[PDB]
Amino acid sequence: ELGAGQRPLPETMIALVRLSGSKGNAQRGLELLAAMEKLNYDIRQAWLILVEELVRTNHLEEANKVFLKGARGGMRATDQLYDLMIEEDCKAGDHSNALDISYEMEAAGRFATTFHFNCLLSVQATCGIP
Amino acid sequence: MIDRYKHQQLRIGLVSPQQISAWATVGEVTKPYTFHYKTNK
Amino acid sequence: PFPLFQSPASSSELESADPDFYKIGYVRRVRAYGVEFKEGPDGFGIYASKDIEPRRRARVIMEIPHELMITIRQKHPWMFFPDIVPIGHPIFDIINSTDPERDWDLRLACLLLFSFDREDHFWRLYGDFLPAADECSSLLLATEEDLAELQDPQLVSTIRQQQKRVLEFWEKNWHSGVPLKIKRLAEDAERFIWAVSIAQTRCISMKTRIGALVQDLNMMIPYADMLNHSFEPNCFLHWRPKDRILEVMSNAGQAIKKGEEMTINYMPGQKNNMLMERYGFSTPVNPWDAIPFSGDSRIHLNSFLSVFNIFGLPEEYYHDSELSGDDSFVDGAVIAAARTLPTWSDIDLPPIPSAERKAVKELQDECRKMLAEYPTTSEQDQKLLDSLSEARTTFATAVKYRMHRKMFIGKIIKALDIYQERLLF
Numbered sequence: 001e002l003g004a005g006q007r008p009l010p011e012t013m014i015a016l017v018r019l020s021g022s023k024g025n026a027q028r029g030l031e032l033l034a035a036m037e038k039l040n041y042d043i044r045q046a047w048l049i050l051v052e053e054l055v056r057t058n059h060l061e062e063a064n065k066v067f068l069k070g071a072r073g074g075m076r077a078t079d080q081l082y083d084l085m086i087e088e089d090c091k092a093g094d095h096s097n098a099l100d101i102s103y104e105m106e107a108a109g110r111f112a113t114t115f116h117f118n119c120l121l122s123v124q125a126t127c128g129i130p
Numbered sequence: 131m132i133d134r135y136k137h138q139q140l141r142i143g144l145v146s147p148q149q150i151s152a153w154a155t156v157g158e159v160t161k162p163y164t165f166h167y168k169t170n171k
Numbered sequence: 172p173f174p175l176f177q178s179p180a181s182s183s184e185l186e187s188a189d190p191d192f193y194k195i196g197y198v199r200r201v202r203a204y205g206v207e208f209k210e211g212p213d214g215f216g217i218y219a220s221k222d223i224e225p226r227r228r229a230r231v232i233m234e235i236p237h238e239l240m241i242t243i244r245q246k247h248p249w250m251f252f253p254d255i256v257p258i259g260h261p262i263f264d265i266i267n268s269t270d271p272e273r274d275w276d277l278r279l280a281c282l283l284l285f286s287f288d289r290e291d292h293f294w295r296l297y298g299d300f301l302p303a304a305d306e307c308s309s310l311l312l313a314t315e316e317d318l319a320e321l322q323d324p325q326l327v328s329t330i331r332q333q334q335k336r337v338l339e340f341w342e343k344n345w346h347s348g349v350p351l352k353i354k355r356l357a358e359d360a361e362r363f364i365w366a367v368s369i370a371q372t373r374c375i376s377m378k379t380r381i382g383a384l385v386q387d388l389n390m391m392i393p394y395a396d397m398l399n400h401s402f403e404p405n406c407f408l409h410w411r412p413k414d415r416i417l418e419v420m421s422n423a424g425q426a427i428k429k430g431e432e433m434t435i436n437y438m439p440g441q442k443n444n445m446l447m448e449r450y451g452f453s454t455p456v457n458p459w460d461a462i463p464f465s466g467d468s469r470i471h472l473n474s475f476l477s478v479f480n481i482f483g484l485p486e487e488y489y490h491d492s493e494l495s496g497d498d499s500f501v502d503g504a505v506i507a508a509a510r511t512l513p514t515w516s517d518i519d520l521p522p523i524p525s526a527e528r529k530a531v532k533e534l535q536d537e538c539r540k541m542l543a544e545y546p547t548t549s550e551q552d553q554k555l556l557d558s559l560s561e562a563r564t565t566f567a568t569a570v571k572y573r574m575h576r577k578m579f580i581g582k583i584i585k586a587l588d589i590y591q592e593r594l595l596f
């Protein structure tokens with residue numbers, strides 16, 4: 001499609017990153033997302049799907065890399081994604097990433113309710129320091 | 131709103147003789163001396 | 172190229188407002204930066220006096236002190252800030268004898284009439300710049316002639332329901348036995364209808380922090396209601412709590428050209444029927460207008476979204492300008508089609524163009540029926556308005572509402588047409 005010389009459709013671009021997320025290829029997924037920004041598209045909506053796919057395929061560590069990098073950019077994730085991403089990290093004992101994600105959510109305009117703090121406490125209660 | 135947590139514990143307590151030796155690791159002192167009067171050593 | 176050689180010396184419907192309009196506010200610590208108030212046959216409006224070069228953050232446009240506003244809590248108890256009602260005044264009993272959730276407009280109307288009676292209140296001066304009973308576009312003032320022409324049984328029933336509620340409230344609280352201080356507020360039933368119309372069409376609910384207290388207030392901010400409505404506003408309302416100043420701020424990083432109108436969104440997302448019920452106006456570019464549709468036929472909205480450069484989640488549907496290049500067709504009207512049209516979508520399942528082509532005409536086969544349901548056409552109504560020269564403004568709005576709805580049906584007919592052929596490429 002690039003060799004022919006026309007701009008790929010966003011649906012094609014969205015399908016590409018979703019396929020990469022299904023196989024957990026983080027490097028391929030981020031490279032395609034960079035192309036969309038270079039193609040001047042809405043990277044945020046595709047960025048949500050890639051993060052969800054990595055969580056769906058249990059590639060949580062790679063999902064943290066993708067989610068945080070988008071989080072530092074300034075784009076705001078959906079409410080479900082914040083709840084999903086934080087809960088998975090706390091279930092996996094990833095409070096370091098969960099707390100960092102929670103801080104990004106606070107800067108994104110959403111405040112941590114009781115649910116988000118409960119996830120964090122599930123890990124802090126096992127650190128041995130009350 | 132998540133407070134920027136900063137936990138800094140500052141404990142004090144009696145020190146075991148082993149940890150006293152750990153401070154001097156060998157730092158045994160036996161001569162009750164100081165700078166020499168003439169050589170200033 | 173010298174200034175002496177250069178000899179510099181449209182929009183006739185808009186004239187500069189009375190200088191006293193800004194002056195009476197300017198003396199009360201009201202500052203408008205880079206904007207000016209213009210008035211016309213439609214009404215007032217704020218238009219930029221110069222090009223607003225975008226900055227890192229939002230730019231201050233207007234400032235309104237708290238003492239110039241009329242504010243009442245949305246939730247019981249009813250406490251008025253910049254307190255104007257004296258303790259023991261009989262007008263509080265009228266206000267306190269209202270529905271806690273349905274009579275928000277009535278409680279503001281009582282304060283609005285009370286403020287006009289007060290000699291020291293600022294709104295007794297600002298009330299002269301409010302539209303009269305005939306000039307106001309609220310449907311609450313419309314009669315059956317305009318309501319019948321509105322051609323909306325649901326909307327007409329709601330409007331006539333409100334008229335009974337407002338009129339009966341005046342009858343109960345403005346009988347012959349009221350004190351003169353209450354009777355003079357509403358000498359006739361008609362004036363109270365106008366008071367409620369102003370309250371409905373100019374209330375601005377907002378969560379404001381006054382001192383240490385945070386609450387929701389049905390506010391009556393002056394000079395800020397004059398901002399017109401647009402679902403893609405160029406400015407928003409921000410409450411500054413330290414000095415009790417309501418700031419009108421243009422969106423950050425957005426340039427405003429000379430003469431461009433400053434607009435805010437009265438409601439986040441609503442249909443034209445809601446706007447007519449509340450504010451008595453409609454917009455053909457509403458991205459929230461719906462239309463009943465059979466669920467048998469549906470299309471792939473992802474293809475529909477992309478062909479018009481619409482991106483984001485349905486809660487944040489928007490169009491990209493530079494990607495489309497010019498695309499004069501796409502507007503906020505077609506965005507509503509992306510929601511109200513029956514659609515289907517899988518993970519990545521591509522659609523069948525022939526099946527959609529089999530359905531696009533079938534979809535458009537239904538679309539011609541609703542236009543046939545209304546006896547008049549979209550161009551017939553607007554042609555009538557140009558020919559019309561003596562009628563109530565609510566009649567024009569009722570014409571506009573059905574015209575906008577008909578165009579909304581007309582817009583999607585063209586939208587499906589261009590979508591169908593563009594699907595091949």
Ligand SMILES: Nc1ncnc2c1ncn2[C@@H]1O[C@H](CSCC[C@H](N)C(=O)O)[C@@H](O)[C@H]1O
Nearest residue numbers: 214215216308372396397399400450451452
């Ligand atoms: N975007 C818009 N399109 C058409 N009429 C609008 C509008 N925004 C506001 N109005 C008009 O203004 C009323 C709300 S109060 C806004 C003040 C008014 N524009 C004035 O000139 O004094 C509506 O009932 C409608 O009559």
